[PDB]
Each structure stands twice: as C-alpha cells, then as structure tokens.
From a paper:
In such microorganisms, the majority of small molecules are taken up by members of the OprD outer membrane protein family. Here we show that OprD channels require a carboxyl group in the substrate for efficient transport, and based on this we have renamed the family Occ, for outer membrane carboxylate channels. As expected from pairwise sequence identities that range from 35%–50%, the Occ proteins share a similar architecture, with a slightly off-center constriction formed by the inward-folded extracellular loops L3 and L7 and residues in the barrel wall. The transport data demonstrate that Occ channels have a pronounced preference for substrates with a carboxyl group, due to the universal presence of a basic ladder on one side of the barrel wall.
In addition to these new structures, we obtained much higher resolution data and more complete structures for OccD1 (formerly OprD; 2.15 Å versus 2.9 Å previously) and OccK1 (formerly OpdK; 1.65 Å versus 2.8 Å previously). As a comparison, the OccK1 pore is slightly larger in diameter than that of E. coli LamB, which is a channel specific for sugars. For OccK channels, conductance values are on average somewhat larger than those of OccD subfamily members, ranging from ∼50 pS for OccK4 to ∼300 pS for OccK1, OccK5, and OccK7. Vanillate, while being transported by OccK1, is clearly not the preferred substrate for this channel since relatively high substrate concentrations (10 µM) and long uptake times had to be used to obtain relatively low specific activities. This result is consistent with previous single-channel experiments, where the affinity of vanillate for OccK1 was found to be quite low (∼2 mM). Notably, while the current OccK1 structure contains two vanillate molecules, they are not bound at positions relevant for transport, confirming that vanillate is not a good substrate for OccK1. An interesting finding is the efficient lowering of OccK1-mediated benzoate transport by octanoate and caproate, suggesting that OccK1, but not OccD1 and OccK2, can serve as an uptake channel for medium-chain and possibly short-chain fatty acids. OccK1 is the least specific channel, also allowing the efficient passage of certain linear compounds such as medium-chain fatty acids. As judged by the inhibition of transport, OccK1 interacts with carbenicillin and cefoxitin. Intriguingly, OccK1-mediated transport is also affected by tetracycline, which is a non-β-lactam polyketide compound that does not have a carboxyl group.
Residue numbers in the entry: 4 to 24, 33 to 70, 76 to 390
Amino acid sequence: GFLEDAKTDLVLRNYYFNRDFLVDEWAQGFILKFSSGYTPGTVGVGLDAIGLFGVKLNSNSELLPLHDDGRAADNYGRVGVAAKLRVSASELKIGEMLPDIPLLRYDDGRLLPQTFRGFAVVSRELPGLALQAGRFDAVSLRNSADMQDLSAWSAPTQKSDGFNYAGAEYRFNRERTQLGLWHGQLEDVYRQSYANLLHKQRVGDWTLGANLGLFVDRDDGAARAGEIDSHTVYGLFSAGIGLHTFYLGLQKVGGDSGWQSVYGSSGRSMGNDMFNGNFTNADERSWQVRYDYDFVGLGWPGLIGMVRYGHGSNATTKAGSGGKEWERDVELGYTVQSGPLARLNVRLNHASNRRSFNSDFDQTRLVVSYPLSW
Ligand SMILES: COc1cc(C(=O)[O-])ccc1O
Ligand SMILES: COc1cc(C(=O)[O-])ccc1O
C-alpha cells in the first residue's frame, strides 16, 4: 500500500573539507528521502520525494555554490519529486531521481547528491535479465540548488538537449557472473557504448573477482564538444581472504580523445577511479594497487580501512603529451555498531595527487553522517 509500505529516511551529513596546494570548507547537510509504497492492483502507483538542504559553517570544495564574487553561499537546497508506476516486474519513474547506471553515475561525493530530471524504466520480466532505458533532460549539480541542461565533462559549457540510454544486464552462473551491454547518447555531444563482465569465484578460502569493462566513445550529432573518438579498457581484479582484500587495476585509454561522461557525474564506473580522478586522459595508461582491511580482527567491529595507489602515464592533455600522474588515497571509516549512537558513521580520508600536467595537492576530509529512518 501507498502509506503502508512508505519509508522515510533522513541523513544528517557534517562535512569538513581541506585541500592544501591551505584552503578549507565546513558545512552541514540534510538529505531527506520519502519513498511511498505502491497502490495495489495491475498498475501500482507511487511517489518518491527528495529534500536537500545545506548550510555553510565557519572556515572544490564544491560543498556549496559560489556567488559571482567567488564567495560561498550561506545555504542552498531543493526539493524533487518522482512519480512511479509498476506493472508485473517492470517499473517506470518520471521526475527527479538519482540515476546509478554504468553510463551515468550520480555524484554524491560532497554535501548533497547530484540529481537528474527525466524518466527511467527498469524491466525484469525474464529470469536473470534486467533491461533499462531512459532519458534525462536536466541535471542539478552536487554543488547547485538549480537545474540546468546536461553537458560533458570534456566541454562543460556546451549544452545538450538530454541524455538517452538503454542497457541490459544478465546475471547467471549461480549469481557469480554478470554481463552488461549499454548504449548512451548525450544528444549533439557524444555517444558511448559499454560492455562489462563481472565474475567472482571461490578458490578455497580465497574469493577472486574480476570487473572488466570496455567503453567506446564518439561524437554525436552537431558535435558541440568537438570531434571525439576514444576507447577505454579496464580490468579491476580482487583477491579476498578472511578480513583482507587486495586489488590490482589495469587500464588504458586509446584513440584521439579521453573517456566521456556527463558533467558533474561520478567516474566510479571506471576501473581505476579514485577520490580525485580516474586516469582517463587521452592515451593514458594506468595501474592501481589497493588493500582493504576489516578491523573486527583487532576487536574494532565497524571500523574498516582502505589504502590505494594509482599511477598514470602517457597522458595527452591540451598542454602536451607524455603526461604522468599519481594518486594515493587512505581512508578509515567507522560505523557505530550498537548503543544510542548506532549507525553513526565517521569517515576520515586523505588523498595526495601529483600531476606533471596540472596542480599538485593534498586533500583531507572528515564526514560524520547519521541516518534516521521511520
Ligand atoms: C525522488 O526521491 C527519491 C529518489 C530516489 C532515487 O532515485 O534513488 C530514492 C529515494 C527518493 O526519495
Ligand atoms: C613530474 O611530475 C610527476 C612525475 C611522475 C612520474 O615520473 O611518475 C608522477 C607524477 C608527477 O606529478
């Protein structure tokens, strides 16, 4: 039922951000999600809403929008609604939403999430197969209260009428393997095709995983961001045992151009994605090593750590070719497991970025999040 199965989730997010090239930002966010149930019947009808509000505290950062003078706003926010319709094992949503698909990953790396306006269909009528398609005609950046036309990261000022997509994922092999094929079009800017293989296998105490991906990009229509021709391949491999996980990522961009994506979106589909980049400049070859540990092994359940290092070379940018870069990320995340503060999450992380072709910097963040649900 519409009211029966309705859930309300509120997240309080206190976010401290520092980047030393020392500049600083501190802010408080509120993210309110109201998700109804579905009316009973052949066509079920529902409504989702999202409320976003951020407040500046005394002190990228992209935590808050900037005034024209370059001064961060005191506060910002917006409210979005989406209608939902369900039939059998298929759903259509229309309005404002948070798309999380391989060709369009909504960003939530700062204070409030990026949202999009459009429609999205998910259909699971055949066992193991999920079909998706949709179109988004406006976007609200993570650091904006407003909606604007979409554009590509490679030319953020060149606007498009919208982003269309369709894709399929098939999961099989006792749920161990998944294949994905996706096609997207940012109208008059670029078209992108993507293939993905996910696979996991247990060898004794080890869990071995692979995430292989291939993107192929070209300009579309009027080609407002210029001519584009790119392909990007990555393989991210994991080996887990007990409380430990090890990763090796390998990636290469080829062709005339870098890898394409929608401006403001997250780079997290890419194998070597890190906090401050994903090594997708034209021609760029990169590798990554990563280690994760679950500190329950030291009597600290709820505490998890990650360290990762990535290096890119052969990078072509406007300035020149043969560019090199590296990033090192470290994170400790703690989630309170029990007691009055249960579910409270504290994440502390640090990134060091060095680039032969751009500015070097270190970055420190502390994010304290508390979820309430009723
Ligand atoms: C528009 O409001 C919502 C959107 C979403 C989403 O798209 O994932 C989730 C919960 C919401 O309340
Ligand atoms: C000269 O600047 C850099 C060089 C390298 C390198 O040689 O691997 C890496 C990152 C840099 O920022």
